A paper describes a structure:
Here, we describe the biochemical and structural properties of the Finnish founding CMT2K mutation H123R and CMT2K‐linked R120W, both of which are autosomal dominant mutations. The disease variant proteins retain close to normal structure and solution behavior, but both present a significant decrease in thermal stability. Using GDAP1 variant crystal structures, we identify a side‐chain interaction network between helices ⍺3, ⍺6, and ⍺7, which is affected by CMT mutations, as well as a hinge in the long helix ⍺6, which is linked to structural flexibility.
Residue numbers in the entry:
A (entry chain B): 23 to 164, 197 to 302
B (entry chain A): 23 to 160, 184 to 302
The structure:
């Protein structure tokens, strides 16, 4: 009856979180990617990240909601049919402050700064998925992300956030018969904290910040978690290709 | 070939400014009024103004822009064909500062609070166009809550009266500005608008504001019967402007869904 309509850019980080929420709630949505394969200056998507500062927008009957967090909040409060998976516990549920604490913590990461740093200072990356020729174009023909010290700070701040997540995932291992059906970050169900986390890890991979932070024996619960979400059906269906620079 | 798409609510104040800008620039736009003739609780548009959910959105190719001021700024910067009227002076014009000053002065007015004030405290209006029944819809603890609600009302009236006096100060400045335009203009010839001869974004904001103040019942306090006669003449003129009448001619008419 009442259509759900989303306007968004496939490769915007905000939108990827919105789209995964929609799929995790199994909502039918008429999704419009308005990004173009090539810009005026014949640049592809990966040369145009965290440009503009615009936000995705949802239209649902009479309601118009801009910005990913507000759209996600609106979807959760609005689609309450019993068959619709909830992604937050009840507002007075035991764990509500835990899910929300992590969600805000991850949603606070300055991803826009990690990206321009990836390009401006590729020396701090490992196996960046952005071609080297972006470093030369977005520097020659062009706070300040240019502060290498700043980037090294927030990367250490990211280290702090992921220690917290790593601890929390060890807690899921102790508490659960570790054989059988494993839980997610905050408990048995996939939450809004999982979307923020899954999408964040995937963008860090894209930028070359996965190996500095996990792998090679570092943060093994996080490595395991990332590998799990990659095989999750909704994630793979919605975001499986979003790091692939061959796909417009 | 790259459509302009607008989603909006017809009777929302922000939407009206946007759609008048589009008409004044003669742009082709696919406009979606997403508002419903009747709500769940069988209320029509003029009982849902106390809504606090009205931000329009423009989609234009790869761009998504929310909120009236940002959308209007985008329209002005983007549509530069020589047939397309400009509604701001060039940034290096002697006139740019006066237009931008008035535009910001008008856009800073707290319109949502005037409308909530209109419904909560109709005694402070004269000839409000909202039916009175939109007001009526919106021993130990028996004395606690009585006193508490008494205090809230006292504070909100003090607030409403405060911003109503601030509206008078803004409109005094506007009256003086229109007095200058009148002094400068031969009584037979092309009458100017607020900031000069061209219709600008400051005129858009003034016109839609005046028309909404009329609807809420805050016009007779501020112009008419000898008060601010230049402002009254301006308002009567803008009601006759073709673009205004086409886009907004009926937006105060509660008979029209």
């Amino acid at each position: 009856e009442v259509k759900l309509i989303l306007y968004h850019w496939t490769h915007s980080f905000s939108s990827q979180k919105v789209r995964l929420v929609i799929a995790e709630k199994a909502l039918k949505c008429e999704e419009h990617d308005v990004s173009l394969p090539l810009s005026e200056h014949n640049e592809p998507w990966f040369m145009r990240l965290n440009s503009t500062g615009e936000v995705p927008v949802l239209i649902h009957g009479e309601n118009i909601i801009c910005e990913a967090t507000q759209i996600i909040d609106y979807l959760e409060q609005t689609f309450l049919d019993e068959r619709t998976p909830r992604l937050m516990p009840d507002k007075e549920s035991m764990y509500y402050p835990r899910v929300q604490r992590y969600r805000e913590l991850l949603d606070s990461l300055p991803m826009d700064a990690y990206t321009h740093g990836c390009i401006l200072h590729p020396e701090l990356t490992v196996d960046s998925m952005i071609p080297a020729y972006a470093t030369t174009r977005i520097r020659s023909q062009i706070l300040d992300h240019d502060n290498v010290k700043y980037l090294k700070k927030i990367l250490d701040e990211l280290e702090k956030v992921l220690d917290q997540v790593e601890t929390e995932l060890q807690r899921r291992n102790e508490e659960t018969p570790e054989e059988g059906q494993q839980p997610w970050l905050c408990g048995e169900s996939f939450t809004l904290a999982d979307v923020s986390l899954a999408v964040t890890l995937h963008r860090l991979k894209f930028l070359g910040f996965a190996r500095r932070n996990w792998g090679n024996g570092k943060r093994p619960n996080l490595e395991t978690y990332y590998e799990r979400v990659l095989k999750r059906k909704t994630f793979n269906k919605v975001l499986g290709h979003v790091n692939n620079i061959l796909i417009s």
